[PDB]
Each structure stands twice: as structure tokens, then as C-alpha cells.
Ligand binder design. Structure first.
Ligand SMILES: [Zn+2]
Length: 180
């Protein structure tokens, strides 16, 4: 019941920050067909302390594990915030360039700017492979809320300016590559 892992890191207005010890939540679905009548094949998971590598190459084993159901293209959303997903982002373009028929939706939070002008540009190259890099949005939480939170399946809306914080961080994402 209630938000367990989402209130842990996906939150934007915590008591006093200092709460982002997580890797990244990802959902493995198909490209973007019409609304399916059944439950479809939506697999939502994370990295945890089981695999030393992020979902760069070890994530493909799940794609290989769920066989006997090939359609055409698969879409994967990646909710990341504070972890080694920077070099992972370079390896991300490697999983996206080796699959090609897969779409990548990488999300970044950061919440702590220091000096990563080339990082944002490298994400542009990972996006050229066929991925999407954008700061966490109220829509990513409203979605992850239904995917990872319970709350009886309630329509979770913005709280103390969550969408205001998602666009405030998105402005910092463009300044990471602009204002160095
Ligand atoms: Zn990663």
C-alpha cells in the first residue's frame, strides 16, 4: 500500500533532500501499439545490489529470457537519478545500437550540478542511436506511481510543485551542456 520505492527516490519535495541511494527503475514494453485488451508484456524492475553492471548489457538477458513472443520493436523507459548511469549512458548507446529495433527513454534527476558538460552531449549521441534523454517529469512519476506504487491504483497528481521541479531540473539539463 502507498508509495514504497517511489516515495524513496521518485519524490521531488522530500523533508530535506539527502535521499537518493537507488540505481534506476525501468519498464520493458513494446514500441507503441494501440491499447491492448489484455495486460500486455510490461516488465518493471530495477538494478538493486544483485548485478554489478547497470541495465546496459545484463538487461538484455531479460529480453532474451522473455522469448516465444517476438513482435517487432520494444520500448524501454529508464528512470535514473543518482548513480553510475553516466558511463552507463555511454554503454546505453551500445545496447540501443546493437538492438536497433528497441527504443530507449532515459530520464535524469541529478539534483546536484558540478561539472558534466560532455556528459549531456554524450547523452545526445546515445539519443542519436534511438533513445530519449529528458529530466524526470510529473508524467514519469504519475506513470511510475501506477507501475511501482500501490495506493489502490489512485490517480496521483502533483504535490508541492512536482511538475514545477521537473521543468526546473529540465532547465538545468540544457544548462549542463550550455552553461559549463
Ligand atoms: Zn544506468
Amino acid at each position: 500500500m502507498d508509495p514504497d520505492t517511489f516515495s524513496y527516490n521518485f519524490n521531488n519535495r522530500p523533508i530535506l533532500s539527502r535521499r537518493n541511494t537507488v540505481w534506476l527503475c525501468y519498464e520493458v514494453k513494446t514500441k507503441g501499439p494501440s491499447r491492448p485488451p489484455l495486460d500486455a508484456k510490461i516488465f518493471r524492475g530495477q538494478v538493486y545490489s544483485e548485478d554489478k553492471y547497470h541495465p546496459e548489457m545484463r538487461f538484455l538477458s531479460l529480453v532474451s529470457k522473455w522469448k516465444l513472443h517476438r513482435d517487432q520493436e520494444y520500448e524501454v523507459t529508464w528512470y535514473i537519478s543518482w548513480s553510475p548511469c553516466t558511463k552507463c549512458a555511454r554503454d546505453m548507446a551500445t545496447f540501443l545500437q546493437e538492438n536497433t529495433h528497441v527504443t530507449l527513454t532515459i530520464f535524469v534527476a541529478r539534483l546536484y550540478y558540478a561539472w558534466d558538460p560532455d556528459y549531456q552531449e554524450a547523452l545526445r549521441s546515445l539519443a542519436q542511436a534511438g533513445a530519449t534523454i529528458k529530466i524526470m517529469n510529473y508524467d514519469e512519476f504519475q506513470h511510475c506511481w501506477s507501475k511501482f506504487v500501490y495506493s489502490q491504483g489512485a490517480p496521483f497528481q502533483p504535490w508541492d510543485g512536482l511538475d514545477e521541479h521537473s521543468q526546473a531540473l529540465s532547465g538545468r539539463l540544457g544548462e549542463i551542456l550550455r552553461h559549463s
